[PDB]
Write a protein that binds this ligand. Structure first.
Ligand SMILES: [Zn+2]
Length: 117
């Protein structure tokens, strides 16, 4: 069985997911997730990516992947991104659109996805 999640959260595999209604910048989105004892979505596989794309909706959604320029992608914990899928764009913060994962300026405002075990 998949994980049992709190209200308004969706269970997938060993994680619970929250799809936001409103828009925030990347750091503010992470701040929301942290307040829920969670983090911006840690997308560790293509299966996980497809799940999110399926249930995300039309708007772009922040996820928990960021990089300083000319540095590799990093999850929130600090572990280096393991290249499971391509991340288009030249931005510092990663988000999901309808097609896949892209990147943008962190101060732009988007919906977001939180995840936790
Ligand atoms: Zn945290």
């Amino acid at each position: 069985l998949q994980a049992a999640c709190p209200e308004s959260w969706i269970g997938f595999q060993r994680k619970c997911f929250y799809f936001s209604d409103d828009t925030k910048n990347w750091t503010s989105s992470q701040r929301f997730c942290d307040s829920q004892d969670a983090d911006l979505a840690q997308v560790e596989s293509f299966q996980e990516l497809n799940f999110l794309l399926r249930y995300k909706g039309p708007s772009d959604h922040w996820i928990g992947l960021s990089r300083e320029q000319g540095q590799p992608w990093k999850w929130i914990n600090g572990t280096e991104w393991t290249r499971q899928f391509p991340i288009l764009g030249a931005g510092e913060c990663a988000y999901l659109n309808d097609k896949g994962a892209s990147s943008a300026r962190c101060y732009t405002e988007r919906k977001w996805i939180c995840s936790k075990s």
